[PDB]
Amino acid sequence: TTALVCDNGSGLVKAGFAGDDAPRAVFPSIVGRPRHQGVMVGMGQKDSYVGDEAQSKRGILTLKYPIEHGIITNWDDMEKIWHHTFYNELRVAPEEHPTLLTEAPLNPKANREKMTQIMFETFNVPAMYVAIQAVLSLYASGRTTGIVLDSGDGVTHNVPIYEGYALPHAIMRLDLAGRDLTDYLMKILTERGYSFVTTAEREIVRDIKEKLCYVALDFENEMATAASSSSLEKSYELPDGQVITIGNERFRCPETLFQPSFIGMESAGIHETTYNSIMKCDIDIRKDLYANNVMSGGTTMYPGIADRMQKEITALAPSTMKIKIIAPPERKYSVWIGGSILASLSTFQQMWITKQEYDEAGPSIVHRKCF
Amino acid sequence: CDLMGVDYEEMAHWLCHRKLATATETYIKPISKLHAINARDALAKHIYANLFNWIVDHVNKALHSTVKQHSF
Numbered sequence: 001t002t003a004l005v006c007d008n009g010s011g012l013v014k015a016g017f018a019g020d021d022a023p024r025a026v027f028p029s030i031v032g033r034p035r036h037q038g039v040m041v042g043m044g045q046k047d048s049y050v051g052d053e054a055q056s057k058r059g060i061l062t063l064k065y066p067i068e069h070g071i072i073t074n075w076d077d078m079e080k081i082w083h084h085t086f087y088n089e090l091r092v093a094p095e096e097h098p099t100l101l102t103e104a105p106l107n108p109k110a111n112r113e114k115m116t117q118i119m120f121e122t123f124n125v126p127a128m129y130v131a132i133q134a135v136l137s138l139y140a141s142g143r144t145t146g147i148v149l150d151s152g153d154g155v156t157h158n159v160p161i162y163e164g165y166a167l168p169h170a171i172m173r174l175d176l177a178g179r180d181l182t183d184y185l186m187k188i189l190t191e192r193g194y195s196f197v198t199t200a201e202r203e204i205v206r207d208i209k210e211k212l213c214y215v216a217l218d219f220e221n222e223m224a225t226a227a228s229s230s231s232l233e234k235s236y237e238l239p240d241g242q243v244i245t246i247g248n249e250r251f252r253c254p255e256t257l258f259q260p261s262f263i264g265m266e267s268a269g270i271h272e273t274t275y276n277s278i279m280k281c282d283i284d285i286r287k288d289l290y291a292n293n294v295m296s297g298g299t300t301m302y303p304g305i306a307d308r309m310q311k312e313i314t315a316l317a318p319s320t321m322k323i324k325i326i327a328p329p330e331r332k333y334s335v336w337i338g339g340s341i342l343a344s345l346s347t348f349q350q351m352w353i354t355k356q357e358y359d360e361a362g363p364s365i366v367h368r369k370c371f
Numbered sequence: 372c373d374l375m376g377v378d379y380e381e382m383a384h385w386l387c388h389r390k391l392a393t394a395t396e397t398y399i400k401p402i403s404k405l406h407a408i409n410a411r412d413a414l415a416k417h418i419y420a421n422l423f424n425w426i427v428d429h430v431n432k433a434l435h436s437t438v439k440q441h442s443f
């Protein structure tokens with residue numbers, strides 16, 4: 001029986017069968033409730049919506065994300081999203097299939113305990129495992145050595161790996177995010193006179209960030225260029241058909257990843273945390289980490305983030321030592337593709353947590369087996 | 372491409388890339404020279420295996436006869 005492979009996050013849910021080439025169900029991970037008084041009678045009013053439904057209705061709804069910063073922060077909505085994933089959107093009963101679940105490293109243990117408890121008790125999944133996102137990115141990109149940098153909505157984290165061994169002391173985690181880039185985009189957009197207050201407006205800001213932002217190769221030169229000229233300035237069409245024009249700001253937004261001081265944090269940007277993570281590795285491997293940098297997750301999709309990273313690391317790293325950045329176009333899905341590869345492997349079939357082992361040991365078993 | 376009829380640009384493009392697609396989006400992805408060679412050899416093996424199955428289907432077309440087979 002093909003195991004399910006499910007990758008949760010803040011932002012999109014990605015789920016599908018192991019051994020597939022690409023995920024079968026992808027939908028933004030939102031639970032929505034109506035906030036207006038239903039006037040019509042016999043409408044079929046519904047307690048709450050999940051996924052694409054909550055996106056379509058969203059003008060009527062309060063949208064709540066049940067995962068902030070890779071932590072599940074209300075378990076009822078998350079359990080609704082799993083219910084929708086197995087029954088509505090894959091249409092396959094969980095009692096048939098092992099399941100593989102995905103988490104950001106250095107999360108609280110209770111998140112794994114509750115997630116396994118809900119899988120065994122509430123869905124009766126015959127076996128389950130929890131993988132690290134960064135590890136799975138290496139399976140997807142076809143390597144056994146490298147420093148992974150993976151940034152989605154919520155968590156950003158670097159995990160160095162060398163010939164299949166992690167280096168826990170060198171793991172870095174940061175809470176820069178697609179989401180904090182979105183809140184920064186709203187707060188800067190206010191400058192030009194446009195105010196996006198409600199959550200359904202935030203979804204518009206998110207779509208502006210996807211379509212129009214790009215990482216400036218050199219920041220101050222493009223700031224001067226945008227001050228001098230309209231040529232950089234580009235415009236977008238809100239759902240109601242009004243147009244808005246956004247300028248230098250569209251490059252200003254994704255640089256905060258490089259300079260968190262804009263949003264107000266002090267911890268250095270993803271380039272300098274990548275370098276500092278390599279430096280926390282022992283001196284013999286470092287050449288191979290510089291030879292492989294693997295990007296993952298949607299927040300690394302910005303045009304020019306690969307070249308800006310390669311340049312700024314090369315500026316940090318000793319001049320002889322070859323720096324390479326590996327940004328595959330698929331990388332938004334590569335954590336799922338890696339989970340598919342892993343779940344397909346025959347050796348892994350040994351390594352599932354089984355329901356009997358859960359009944360014997362209780363939900364704490366996950367810490368013992370998984371990592 | 373001349374022998375097969377397929378247009379040169381399409382073979383030259385597809386031999387050096389593969390296509391992923393989710394239902395909503397599709398990515399054209401480059402592949403290593405080793406993977407290109409493995410794919411070319413897999414295409415040759417697949418053509419030959421189907422040509423063999425076809426020639427056997429025609430031999431069967433000559434060998435069959437219409438009366439219903441009671442036992443063999």
Ligand SMILES: C/C1=C\[C@H](C)C[C@H](C)OC(=O)C[C@H](c2ccc(O)cc2)NC(=O)[C@@H](Cc2c(Br)[nH]c3ccccc23)N(C)C(=O)[C@H](C)NC(=O)[C@@H](C)C1
Pocket residue numbers: 190191192193194195196201238242243244
């Ligand atoms: C359709 C949208 C925007 C607009 C109608 C699109 C047009 C195109 O924007 C403009 O350029 C016009 C104008 C404007 C006025 C003077 C000016 O020197 C520059 C711009 N600014 C406005 O009408 C502001 C004024 C404002 C309120 Br109150 N508090 C705010 C807090 C911060 C900033 C500004 C404001 N305003 C009412 C809005 O944004 C409303 C709330 N916005 C929306 O519903 C969303 C869905 C986007």
Ligand SMILES: Nc1ncnc2c1ncn2[C@@H]1O[C@H](COP(=O)(O)OP(=O)(O)O)[C@@H](O)[C@H]1O
Pocket residue numbers: 008009010011012013151152153154177178179206209210296297298299301302332
């Ligand atoms: N092409 C793109 N450019 C910039 N940001 C993007 C792009 N595509 C998606 N994003 C943003 O990245 C985040 C989703 O990241 P992703 O890793 O897919 O989420 P998850 O952590 O759930 O897998 C969202 O903030 C989304 O708006």
Ligand SMILES: [Mg+2]
Pocket residue numbers: 008009133152297335
């Ligand atoms: Mg992710």
